[PDB]
Symmetry: D2
Subunit: 497 residues, 4 copies
């Protein structure tokens, strides 16, 4: 059998030649018997003094924590990030200090809309989150398998996710909801085209690219700032499942990506991604034809070539899935000195959203969870007492700042990069921005004829379930992108009806 | 389209001719705009004073509650229970007071081992829980589609569920775990035979029987006690999917049972179950060949014929799934006067387990949730303050008992039925009880030849993945049940290998 | 006896002539007996089937919620806000629509640093929070008995509260911590002078003023904006306890303020506060000698006279303290149209802090708690599912925006007031701002000689416990305010040593 | 100053000669500045990208956990238990293995009815809980400063605590509630007499005795069982405060016991208690004049002399109070092999109540908290996944039992002691048991004349506030105990009225 199937036999084999441990309660008291319960004779009612029973059962009753509101279904792996090129001129980050520096990483792959127990091989954006354990605290590059997203304003994210997920009454997937939202929000045409292309259903997690998707800000030691986009492209090469194969695997193995990643790492075939960046100066940002902080836009490779930085290798499988993969938390706000946020509205929304949801899901002290701890750095601050605190709680150190007792002091070299912003403080409309230019470019330059046909059949296959007026509004947006794109979808929809 | 697909259009149509409501915050403050966020000009960072954004997002971040540790994937419906026969001689329950009495009910169907988002049409025991809103508080008949269970001692339940669910390292379904547990626990042969028969994969929730599965105690007004088993058999008739059809539906519609029940109720075809009971006297219980409180045994129909009581009709679909189906809590401990627990160890374990898990999942005051409230009864007691209390908290009534201020008094007519139990208070072994007699009876009397062949191919198909020694231990147990049963499985396993 | 002592007798008297209600479980099942537990004979162990016991006990085990991180000890009352003057030229708020309009209010009085069960009559700032149930959602004026605060930057608030509260090792009140923080932060001199004056220990909650303390922004129907400060001064007149009387009452009645407010409302003597405002134009704000958004500064009455608006009357006592006072949540972010936030950094910090802590303390759906609900307004939005949801969860309404099914639409008349802000986006130092001018004014104009002497003895009495260097740093700050102020404290400290 | 006051200076002195640590976020990212917030210029609104602010504040908002439902106000200390005598004939416990064996202990002192921040020096039963870190898991002797309690049935405990605590409407202490409950429950006369004697207000925690109060069961290696009562009497001698001194200290130092214990341990004066036991055979238990498992009765010293076992010494103060004292959990169910529960109904109720409340207060995985961990024992079991899990979660070990992969096995030598119990399974009344015999004995043998007078004045002083009929019912119970006892109280009450 494959290494995944032989987990228990491998556990037994690695622990051969030693006697079984003593079965104990949570409090370490040895258990006399855990196959029978205390009764008033052979056919008597259960006793309260059955402390072993009530302890076991009570713990069983509290096993489930809340699933992630998005990217619930996931697969986890560990490894390192190796620097191969010098980008010290761009960033002063300790992760990019010198060439050959290895930083340990934790990675989680996921499907955005799928719940815990849903099929892996489905058409959906794939999450690609990376946690760098840097000497200057954790760095969380929370990325996707796509360089863009559907929307450009973070207030629409809850709406988008509600439309992608189940109907509130019927609890069913509603193409009506999906295509109503997408037809009303035409800035999603670019991401929709990517999603319904061949790379919508990647063959496992090893054969997909990864993108930060946001514009980030790199600051050097001299104090100069530039703009960045992180790319981590697969070294195993892009490889995708057909709709028929994906449909087969959905019933055959709904845990295809978990099994594929576990077997790949277990057999020694360590998957690797090459870390690239694009650089954009402040004058280039001001003279960019589009909004350079727009999440629905990309930076063309001819104007902004990829600059190699390093490689990401995954070599270690999780020991316990719940402890290392279910409980791992990725905060985009976790950025070390040299890396900062850009004015990208979406990124600004993510800075709040993640720590808030982590306090709900995992708990107030979720950063004390071993996988979440910045173990390669020293934490010292005036943050004290919360529920489930598993540290000394910084012992008897003064818990107020400023003080006169040598408590932790602020480091002035870790200040943020200052910038002057113009205009009023109000709500600016971005729905009426360019929605079709880069979509047309992708359609008529990147895709070939058979790829365009497959794209149109995939969209038409999903969109046929929506109401007539929603189909018309969707096809109108596809026609405004390109007339052949719209006409082909419309022809297929007419065939389907 | 089907009624399920037209949920939004039906919502719009029923609310036609009125203007859209004002979009407000949680605190009822009208929202100016919820499509854009407040920025420092068109390309500026997000402001903290964007209260609308942070409120929406914070609520979005806290949407997920923990799924049920078991029976996570479920479908909900509402209706009534109509009494058709007089059983007042057996029980003094207000639910069975007089003929033609309608008690409102809430029902939830489920798959035991499936997570939220797993396929509906899979081989697994189906949950069939019924909540009777009786005038003497709620009655929760938390039943299955099978009259028996796998185990007879409640301390093994967490072990059984862990074996049925994912591997702790790989997070994959492990036939190794499933068949190791089943082979080591041969009292599961009866339930295994039922599970791998044709009724393992019922065609939706309308074409399956329901059983309390436990022995219950009926007490009449005179104070005499008897033993009972609740049966609720389908009026639509038993109907099952083939393995191939089930495998197809798993990828086609993973929400087959939710869609089927919603469409059935929406179109007017109300499904119904006929409520039966078996009665066993205390002398019959003492002279029963087996343990009558053994959950792996049934009461034969020739010795204990079914006595009709009433019918269960489901006529109303849930308005909101989360509010009415996700948050519904069924406590087997919720039993009105006239219905009591028997010495069945499993039932004794369920009396503790359910209220404990409900306090974790839903919260301390989960009985204040509308679907969980005993709205057809008056609650008055000395239970006060907890988190998320949405009552007057019983106002200014004395909160101690006994008192001298006319606070709620105990009703002496609601006392439990007293019984003398013999033997020591210790752990009695029940693993070595009869495990094969009723299994043989079922195999060679109920099933025909083609049903026996399908049963053997289904078991062999699942068991082939297990290690050789586990296959041998499983086949040995099947051989001890019946030599043809064991030999046929072994022949198919040899073919598979 | 006083009305407070006769609560139970009054309950009995108002419910005379009716029989005691039936004692039930949470699930409404009548209790047979709740004075004895089920045992295996007279001297036998307790049974698990004692469902009544385990239900009662389990609810008892979950009674405590987390106390407020600050203002834990509190007293609650209800009444109304009556408009007496027209300020429609300043604000378009429905609370200020027309003269004679009564809005129901909920008020909570509190001590900032005291825990639940601490003494009422102690030297500490008193909280004065008011919840207006306006037709445009709830308005929460979360005020103090002082027009200023200790600090002017919200990042120092956790530090300030940690210094005021117990030592992390010893769990004792530490004057060392208090005076170290106050000596290092000399912008606290103004609030310290107010706190150690006669009005530090007010005689109950009826004899103290209330202030919003922040600069707020009033917007009229025409769209013009001004700046505001809310004052609500006592109609019963300012009245204070001596240090000796306060020290006596601390042991005699630690619940002096709760008893005083309950008896005052119960006997019919309804306390009232007169609602005033100060108005500041944008040109006046730009030409103000100090920062007009500085929380440590006041607006002088000669330059900015008080403008009457209405009166606050408290007429109803809480029915249940836990339900109505412990669980009440005041969000400064809850502001109806016509009232907005100013650039006051402290207010900006409060906009985030309160909803975040409420989700922790009370729970995600804390606005479903009756006292927190905006019951005089209609809530409709795309916020769905959370723990402990006790609404229809907005039934089957579309849960995404924008949509095409007539779901709640944004009201364009409720937009925020736009303003252009100059300067870079960075951290600006405000520690070096004016700290002594208004403190000197208060010392040498408002206070008389005997009031100055009492102020100095109160400060010296508290400060004597601190280390010598902290005493020197504190006295230096008092000397920089005024030489007589510093010299008198120093003389008293030398006497104490 | 005393060592308690010099905590911060001692921290500074022990960490002298090293530079202050770098101020970091929770994620270990160095903080640039934590005195100012990011604004849009000097007088601009706060930015969302202020990650340092929102992290600090969010953690501050989640500092409070629920206080203990009882014994909220507490003081903690650590040390060891040294065996001085051989009791191996009675118990096979590893804590009592051999003479001179030192087991580390954690102790918490407390006041039963006081909230967090209430006065220490008040008339109330004092908690005396001891956590033995035995090699066979933790042993929690959760005791009081009194050998008895008020009630003998655990279903009345929530009622008793509600009566002792605040009124549900007024939130005030109600002598009406206290004396109504005590007058209706005359089995409290013994504990009431002890409480209103001189030992009601002990001088700190070092000058009070400690009792298990329950009958426990000692089992030896041979398998013989006896009954036990644990006594731990002070080596510093019994010492009490007068009512006047206690009333003074209530305002002077409400944290008298915390300061006293901290200073005692800090100066080197380690307090010690001598561990005694009483032994009762099964024949003696059957021929005892009273119920030997009755919590309101004692075992007379003449019939059952004290047998020395060892001494309890407290030598170490807590480093952090929240981590070591607030979060410590004592489970009476935590009993190592050789120590078991008796049929005492109260003890049976405590076996359920404590683990249930700990899961609410601290969380499901509260035994992972360092102070709660059985660090001197190895925990291995099939308890997996819960919220806030900070272990490997037992890695990849099989999570079901029984199994075939060498997972932890049950130890047959740790079985419970079996006993045959007679009588029916129902609710037996114990309210009508003897309530006056041992109370009379205590009154007329132990107390002298001036002690009897003080006892009567203390009761009369508290009882005068109750209604006339409650005073009559209380005095009647005191008269039934002894006519002089009743007559003296009545005379003082008549004087008070
Ligand atoms: C940066 C500044 C401040 C922060 C971070 C802050 C934070 C908090 C927090 C977390 C609470 C607990 C609320 C709960 O859990 O129920 C609270 C309560 C309170 N705060 Fe503040 N606060 C600030 C400034 C002020 C100011 C300036 C005032 C008055 C002028 C004030 C008055 C109050 C009052 C009255 C309460 C109690 C509310 C109640 O009755 O429930 N606070 N504050």
């Amino acid at each position: 059998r494959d290494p995944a199937s032989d987990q228990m036999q491998h556990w037994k084999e690695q622990r051969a030649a030693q006697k079984a441990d003593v079965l104990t309660t949570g409090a370490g008291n040895p258990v006399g018997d855990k196959l029978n319960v205390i009764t008033v004779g052979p056919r008597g009612p259960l006793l309260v003094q059955d402390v072993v029973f009530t302890d076991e059962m009570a713990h069983f009753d509290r096993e489930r924590i809340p699933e992630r509101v998005v990217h619930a279904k996931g697969a986890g792996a560990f490894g390192y990030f190796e620097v191969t090129h010098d980008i010290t001129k761009y960033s002063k980050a300790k992760v990019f200090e010198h060439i050959g520096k290895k930083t340990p990483i934790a990675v989680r792959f996921s499907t955005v809309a799928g719940e815990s127990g849903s099929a892996d091989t489905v058409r959906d954006p794939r999450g690609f989150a990376v946690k760098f354990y840097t000497e200057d605290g954790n760095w969380d590059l929370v990325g996707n398998n796509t360089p863009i997203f559907f929307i450009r304003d973070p207030i629409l994210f809850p709406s988008f996710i509600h439309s992608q997920k189940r109907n509130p009454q019927t609890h069913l997937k509603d193409p009506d909801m999906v295509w109503d939202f997408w037809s009303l929000r035409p800035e999603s045409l670019h991401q929709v085209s990517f999603l319904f292309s061949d790379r919508g259903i990647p063959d496992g997690h090893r054969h997909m690219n990864g993108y930060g998707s946001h514009t980030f800000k790199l600051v050097n030691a001299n104090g100069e700032a530039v703009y960045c986009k992180f790319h981590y492209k697969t070294d195993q090469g892009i490889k995708n499942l057909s709709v028929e194969d994906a449909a087969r695997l959905s019933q055959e193995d709904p845990d295809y990506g978990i099994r594929d990643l576990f077997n790949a790492i277990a057999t020694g075939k360590y998957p690797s991604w090459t870390f690239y960046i694009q650089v954009m100066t402040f004058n280039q940002a001001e003279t960019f034809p589009f909004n350079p902080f727009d999440l629905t836009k990309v930076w063309p490779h001819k104007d902004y070539p990829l600059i190699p930085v390093g490689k990401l290798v995954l070599n270690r499988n999780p020991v316990n899935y719940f402890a290392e993969v279910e409980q791992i938390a990725f905060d985009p706000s976790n950025m070390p000195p040299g890396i900062e946020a850009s004015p990208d509205k979406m990124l600004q929304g993510r800075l709040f959203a993640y720590p808030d949801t982590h306090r709900h899901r995992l708990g107030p002290n979720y950063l004390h969870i071993p996988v979440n701890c910045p173990y390669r750095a020293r934490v010292a601050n005036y943050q004290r007492d919360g529920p489930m605190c598993m540290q000394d709680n910084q012992g008897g150190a003064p818990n107020y700042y400023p003080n006169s007792f040598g408590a932790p002091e602020q480091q002035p070299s870790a200040l943020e990069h200052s910038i002057q912003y113009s205009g009023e403080v109000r709500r600016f409309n971005t729905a009426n921005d360019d929605n079709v230019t880069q979509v047309r470019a992708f359609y008529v330059n990147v895709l070939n004829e058979e790829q365009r046909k497959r794209l149109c059949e995939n969209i038409a296959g999903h969109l046929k379930d929506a109401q007539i007026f929603i189909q018309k509004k969707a096809v109108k947006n596809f026609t405004e992108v390109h007339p052949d794109y719209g006409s082909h979808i419309q022809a297929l929809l007419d065939k389907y009806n």
